[PDB]
Amino acid sequence: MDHNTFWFILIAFLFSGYFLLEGFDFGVGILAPIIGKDSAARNTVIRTIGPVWDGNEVWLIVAGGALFAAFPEWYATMFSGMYLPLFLVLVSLIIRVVGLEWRKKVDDPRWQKWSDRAIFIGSWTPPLMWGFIFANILRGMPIKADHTIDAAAALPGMVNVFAILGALAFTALFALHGLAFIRLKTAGRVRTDAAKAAPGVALLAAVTGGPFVLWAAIAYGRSWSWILAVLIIAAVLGGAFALIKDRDGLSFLSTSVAVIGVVALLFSSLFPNVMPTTLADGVSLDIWNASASHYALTILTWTAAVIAPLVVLYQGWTYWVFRKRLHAEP
């Protein structure tokens, strides 16, 4: 295939790795004060993602950088049009960074409660606002002839039913993903508490993502987009089901398939376009008018093919080192 198609697929892969790894991250963060109900339990829940959340954050960093290098026009238009939503994502991410890293610098209840507030904000805002952003990307934006979005007139238009439903769907999906992750990476009473809170998280995922995934597949997708949406819904159901059957390995795998399917749907229903225009006079961005040079794509392809597999290898080795399930002291 062309290099443009290859780098569209690579950006989709980077965003899927992000939304997958940072997805359980946000699920663990959201469900820490919901499942914990206790300092010992909440600390173990946060400790599940402690050693590996920085790498998950990096995946986002690389998604942004590679979308800047492969598709500069896409990077500029998406990030300038969606200014304030991205600002909210970034503020919550900063607050989560400090809330997670500084959590153990002080052994005091006031410090821990402020850390919990930081973790709450940084685990709730990013899923919501990423769903908002990506639903608006798929629906379309007021893109002009110069590939520029006003972002002040476009902001009220962004607040629509499809974007709100996407936000809720992303939050529910990442909550289910983090729940399956907690089931996989904990032992003792914390795991049982996660099982106790499984029904509510599942129901919300099934009732919000399903409508959203089907709507996005049908209205703005292709003829097989409904097939992909059915796969996503079935993956969510299997993940919720495998959790009940104590298949915490298979539950996390199924919710993983669900998240990657959501990303694959959002990008395949977008391809070949990269930024659908809502203005008739304006021009939509695709993998050709919004792209880097062939030489730049060649250099990027070489470096990415050489380095990214090694990154995945040693990150997986780290996840293997920290494979042992955590326990909660009384």
């Binding site: 959340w53 990096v58 690389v62 950088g65 990030f79 400090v98 520029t148 780290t318």
Partner: protein, 442 residues
């Protein structure tokens, strides 16, 4: 005030906050790795205590360094879309490589260092901290390659069809003389920061312990910091001299601000009418500040050597003056790094991508220039005001908590233990105050 200057202020504030914390990481990850290697090979307990103490400081600094970093990468396209379009072909490659190699290495292996003490062999733990140090240096290199393309664009050709500078020589971009000169200098700046910090804290604690085995870690750590400070000062002098020679040729307007009228005339008669000079005051005082604060670090190093020779320890009012001098000298390299980068970015003005002087004749590369007014994403000013205020307040809170938390860790002092203990689950990465209230009782 219009959106351009608000966006400039936001970028400046956010990334000045970021490089408040970057140099300490750049210098201290290597120093912590060195201290832990010493503990591994020599076996002495005081090296383990030094590892724990300065690794506590390192982890606090690394935390605030990551968040400010996150905003900078996105801020690029959020606030400077036209810039992000003109250069993303050639500028975005170094950013992608930085994230893919250096950020992944440092994040993954610092997670291992913080959490995987007994889960891996101790030599592999020291390898993890060494990898984090090397990865921080690599990230410095790739970021500096990107900024040096901004300062001195090479390896790019203008494409009139896309109206955009496009990558045509990857090797010329990576081995840009501006990048190859500015990278060692930023590394030596980070090392000066960390060495000054270690030296000041260790001298303060030597005096404090004398006034009050368990504190035996201060003198070896003091000498580690002393050697780091001296070597980094020499490296800074050499690399800054190299960069001065480069800046003479590539960016005559920067040094003329550190003649300005002749260069302004040539600029307006080559790129059209308009101001083409930086802020003379800010440039002048940043450059001088980038120097005087190094003078301060050297002063503290010399005084520490004078007072602490031959295992000596001051006992009079000299001891109190030495403690005060150490604590006062600690912020000097942070301010020096900030001043140097402020000089760089303000003297870059009014260009977000500077016109390469050698590229003037070449038509196929003469259009790689861009100004700051033409590179900003057009926003309603209330949005930029909102983001600037939010970032400034959040960063002020983070910096205040950071100072408080390092002060708490330092005041707690070195760990009583000299070797990791299965009980209390402590290791070379455990923070000093991890088992103490917000205000420790003693």
């Amino acid at each position: 005030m219009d959106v351009v200057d608000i966006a400039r202020w936001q970028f400046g504030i956010t990334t000045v906050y970021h490089f408040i914390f970057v140099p300490l990481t750049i210098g201290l990850a290597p120093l912590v790795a060195i201290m832990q290697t010493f503990w591994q090979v020599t076996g002495k307990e005081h090296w383990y205590r030094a590892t724990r103490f300065f690794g506590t400081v390192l982890l606090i600094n690394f935390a605030v360094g990551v968040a400010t970093g996150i905003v900078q990468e996105f801020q690029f396209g959020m606030n400077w879309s036209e810039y992000s379009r003109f250069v993303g072909d050639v500028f975005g490659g170094p950013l992608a490589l930085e994230g893919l190699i250096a950020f992944f290495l440092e994040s993954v292996f610092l997670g291992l260092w913080i959490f995987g003490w007994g889960k891996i062999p101790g030599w592999l733990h020291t390898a993890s901290i060494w990898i984090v140090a090397i990865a921080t240096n690599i990230s410095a290199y790739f970021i500096i390659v990107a900024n040096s393309f901004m300062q001195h664009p090479v390896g790019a050709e203008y494409n009139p069809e896309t109206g955009r500078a496009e990558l045509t020589d990857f090797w010329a971009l990576l081995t840009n003389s501006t990048a190859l000169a500015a990278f060692p200098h930023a590394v030596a700046g980070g090392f000066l920061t960390a060495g000054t910090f270690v030296l000041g804290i260790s001298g303060w604690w030597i005096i404090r312990a004398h006034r009050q085995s368990k504190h035996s870690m201060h003198r070896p750590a003091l000498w580690v910091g002393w050697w780091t400070t001296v070597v980094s000062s020499v490296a800074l002098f050499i690399t800054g001299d190299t960069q001065a020679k480069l800046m003479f040729v590539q960016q005559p307007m920067k040094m003329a601000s550190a003649g300005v009228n002749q260069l302004q005339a040539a600029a307006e008669q080559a790129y059209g009418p308009g101001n083409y000079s930086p802020n003379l005051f800010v440039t002048y005082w940043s450059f001088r500040a980038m120097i005087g604060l190094m003078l301060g670090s050297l002063a503290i190093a010399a005084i520490a050597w004078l007072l602490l020779r031959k295992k000596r320890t001051p006992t009079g009012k000299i001891a109190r003056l030495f403690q005060i001098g150490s604590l006062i000298a600690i912020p000097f390299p942070f301010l020096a790094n900030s001043a140097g980068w402020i000089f760089t970015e303000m003297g870059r003005q009014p260009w977000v991508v500077h016109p390469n002087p050698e590229s003037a004749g070449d038509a196929r590369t003469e259009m790689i220039r861009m100004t700051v007014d033409m590179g900003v994403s057009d926003h309603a000013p209330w949005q930029v005001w909102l983001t600037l205020i939010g970032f400034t307040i959040l960063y002020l809170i983070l910096f205040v908590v950071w100072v408080w938390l390092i002060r708490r860790a330092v005041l707690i002092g070195p760990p009583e233990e000299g070797a990791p203990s299965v009980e209390a689950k402590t290791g070379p990465a455990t923070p000093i105050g991890s088992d103490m209230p917000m205000t420790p009782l003693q």
